[PDB]
Ligand binder design. Structure first.
Ligand SMILES: CCc1oc2ccccc2c1C(=O)c1cc(I)c(O)c(I)c1
Ligand SMILES: CCc1oc2ccccc2c1C(=O)c1cc(I)c(O)c(I)c1
Lengths: 115, 115
């Protein structure tokens, strides 16, 4: 699992469950091409998005649909989505965990990158 | 000043000075059109982006060039940029501060919306 995404809820102190997200990869013409998508599980984690063969060098974007998550909880959030953009595998393959911690008007994102 | 941006540095404990950013407004065809841009001041703030007349309801994206900021300090960053995508809503007189707190492998953003 070279790319995993973990989402937490800072209001409830819990994993953020059923959070949809889309992953895009920048193509040679500099447009965003669909790469993978999914939703977080009961643990707030989304596994199995890609494989080591498919996950080549490039610039990737993870668009986390935080708006839908908050609205289903009756909260009108500030952000449309949390957007994480990064170069992957520039120095050879890595494993990437993209984490997001969500509040209605704020979010943080970090990456844990291992060899 | 209906819209202001402030950027802090979590490694140095200081405003993030000379950080470039562009603001985009979502167009009818889902494209991002340039709206405003600038560089943060010695206080890490960017003022005068727009006016109340021009800053109408809609979806806006602030794209913060965090990669160049870290490169200039000699620090290897994870993100290509920090993106903040939000809907501007007319519900009372509102002034928006978009803030970002930067680390090489992590960032946080929040909105301080006041009257
Ligand atoms: C931005 C997301 C985030 O905010 C934080 C605030 C305080 C401490 C950690 C975090 C954190 C994490 O990244 C994170 C949390 C867990 I639990 C975890 O298992 C993994 I891997 C990553
Ligand atoms: C993500 C932005 C952010 O990260 C933080 C981490 C800890 C405490 C506060 C913050 C903070 C702020 O909102 C913020 C900070 C300052 I100083 C400020 O002048 C204004 I307006 C806003």
């Amino acid at each position: 699992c070279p790319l995993m995404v973990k989402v937490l809820d800072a209001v409830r102190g819990s994993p953020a469950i059923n959070v949809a997200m889309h992953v895009f990869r920048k193509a040679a013409d500099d447009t965003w091409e669909p790469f993978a998508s999914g939703k977080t599980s009961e643990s707030g984690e989304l596994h199995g998005l890609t494989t080591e063969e498919e996950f080549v060098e490039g610039i990737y974007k993870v668009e986390i649909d935080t708006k839908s998550y908050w609205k289903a909880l009756g909260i009108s959030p500030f952000h449309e989505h949390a957007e994480v953009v990064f170069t992957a595998n520039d120095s050879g393959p890595r494993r990437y965990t993209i984490a997001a911690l969500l509040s209605p008007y704020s979010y943080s994102t970090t990456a844990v990158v291992t060899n």
